[PDB]
């Protein structure tokens, strides 16, 4: 009951200590139907060159770590043919499978929350100011939450308790989420469908959802146990569609 296998394209993930799988709102990803479309040209569907697991770079979970976030898309814009299909079209559409891995021994302890937040609009550390995109995202590198109130210009207000959105961090369980409790499991898996108020959208302009990893119980260990404990993310697009082919944009 704890072993699982997931195959997509030419990639496969195995796990021996999984809890279950979260399907965001009971809805699996699927293609756009004819009585819900507005764009008229025939779309392209690569179907194995884009729908496969891509791995980002890892972060180091330390004894005093506030947490991390990524923005999707724009974290996969340099990933193979998914990124190339993003650069040549005006409209795109895709669901995702997210898989977070972190293993440790039976003498370690700690607890992480893994949550996906749709339309996570963030605020600036200067209240009479506006944010820029570098402070929101660094591609495949993670942004870091902070330990206290932040200051200075152009940075995002990132104290963990408010999640940078002006809410209580303990209520983020309203979104699709799982937990990694080091004594129970070593991986989390979330299946996210396409969620928007329009049927397709431009993938450079709009961040569809933010992935947050926040430790509630810090990492602890004793005399000569291993000190280096990394966390790794792996994401696979599903039912990917593109419309509006023209010359390649340049950021």
């Amino acid at each position: 009951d704890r072993v699982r296998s997931i195959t997509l394209g030419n990639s496969t993930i195995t796990t021996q200590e999984s809890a279950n799988v979260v399907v965001a709102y009971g809805r699996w990803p699927e293609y756009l139907k004819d009585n819900e479309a507005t764009a008229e040209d025939q779309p392209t569907q690569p179907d194995v060159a884009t729908c496969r697991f891509y791995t980002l770079e890892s972060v180091t979970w330390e004894r005093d770590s506030p947490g991390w976030w990524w923005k999707f898309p724009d974290a996969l814009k340099d990933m193979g043919l998914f990124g190339q299909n993003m650069y040549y079209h005006y409209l795109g559409r895709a669901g995702y499978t997210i898989h977070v891995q972190c293993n440790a021994s039976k003498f370690h302890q700690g607890c992480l929350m893994v949550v996906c937040v749709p339309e996570a609009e963030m605020g600036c550390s200067q209240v009479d100011g506006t944010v820029n995109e570098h402070s929101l995202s660094e591609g495949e590198t993670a942004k870091k939450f902070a330990s206290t109130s932040t200051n200075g210009t152009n940075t995002v207000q990132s104290i963990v308790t408010n999640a940078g959105m002006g809410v209580g961090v303990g209520n983020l369980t309203i979104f699709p989420h799982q937990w990694i409790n080091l004594r129970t499991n070593n991986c989390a898996t979330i299946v996210m469908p396409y969620i928007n108020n329009v049927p397709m959208d431009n993938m450079f302009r709009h961040h569809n959802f933010t992935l947050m990893i926040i430790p509630f119980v810090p990492l602890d260990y004793s005399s000569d146990s291993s000190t280096y404990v990394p966390i790794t993310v792996t994401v696979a697009p599903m039912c990917a569609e593109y419309n509006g082919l023209r010359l390649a944009t340049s950021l």
Partner: protein, 285 residues
């Protein structure tokens, strides 16, 4: 007796599942020269999953779009003055002086509906050096005069007998007055635009004022009192219902100039940006 009436809910189309293709069907190739708009969906150009869509187009129907109250006129009148024409308010009926409702109505060429009319009346004291008096509640009269009826000359004119004209009497501190009006036009539908003249020699009056002719409104104080002067303001609100509209038009781009014409000052198509390729970067550390 009870009668059950059924209401059909209307939702948008579902998207169907679609797979790879290699054939001679070219749904994405068209020709706009025909005047035809392409009926292509995402499932004709990409691979899609099946989605059951439950969204409804209920708030974009014409009735829900137009059935709200909007201000169309505001006016002032006194209880005591030295002009005797500022003791009552009067105006000709139309919907062309407040730009919001009138731009909303001008999305169509012809319209037909009944109306619900509401009035909001407020009073205030005129700035004098000596204040202090108790005044009884004020009463106001509103009279509608269809074209051809006699016109009041003062606030004591015999014409406020209102024997055949419909009037409203109201006193302050109560709910706002309200009444409904049917579709009153000598034509089969109202006309928002008229590209014609009034005289057969192709001159005279041009445009909208040729066709409306729907009477006037007069408002006065009934007390005839107040050694210390007061001032009232009346506001009128329209709300159309049981609507039908024909021949849609492009929305007004330029700002309005007056209530009679469609006159305008040339305006741009939009505001500018840096270059035809400019992109705002928002993913930065």
């Amino acid at each position: 007796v009870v009668e059950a009436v059924e209401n059909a809910v209307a939702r948008v189309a579902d998207t169907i599942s679609s797979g790879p293709s290699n054939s001679q069907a070219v749904p994405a190739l068209t020709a706009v020269e025909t005047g035809h708009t392409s009926q292509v969906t995402p499932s004709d150009t990409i691979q899609t999953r099946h989605v059951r869509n439950y969204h409804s187009r209920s708030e974009s129907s014409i009735e829900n779009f137009l059935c709200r109250s909007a201000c169309v006129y505001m006016g002032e009148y006194h209880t005591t003055n030295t002009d005797t024409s500022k003791l009552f308010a009067s105006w000709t009926i139309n919907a062309r002086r407040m730009v919001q409702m009138r731009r909303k109505l001008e999305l169509f060429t012809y319209v037909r509906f009944d109306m619900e009319v509401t009035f909001v009346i407020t009073s205030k004291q005129d700035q004098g050096t000596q204040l202090g008096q108790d005044m009884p509640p004020l009463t106001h009269q509103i009279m509608y005069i269809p074209p051809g009826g006699p016109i009041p000359k003062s606030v004591t004119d015999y014409t406020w007998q209102t024997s055949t004209n419909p009037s409203i009497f109201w006193t302050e501190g109560n709910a706002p007055p309200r009444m409904s009006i049917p579709f009153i036009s000598i034509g089969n539908a109202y006309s928002n635009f008229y590209d014609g003249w009034s005289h057969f020699s192709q001159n005279g009056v041009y445009g909208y004022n040729t066709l409306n002719h729907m009477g006037q409104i007069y408002v006065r104080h009934v007390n005839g009192s107040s050694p210390l002067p007061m001032t009232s303001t009346v506001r009128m609100y329209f709300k159309p219902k049981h609507v039908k509209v024909w021949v849609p038009r492009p929305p007004r781009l330029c700002q309005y100039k007056n209530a009679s014409t469609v006159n305008f000052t040339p305006t741009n198509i939009t505001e500018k940006r840096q270059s035809i390729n400019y992109i705002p970067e928002t993913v930065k550390p």
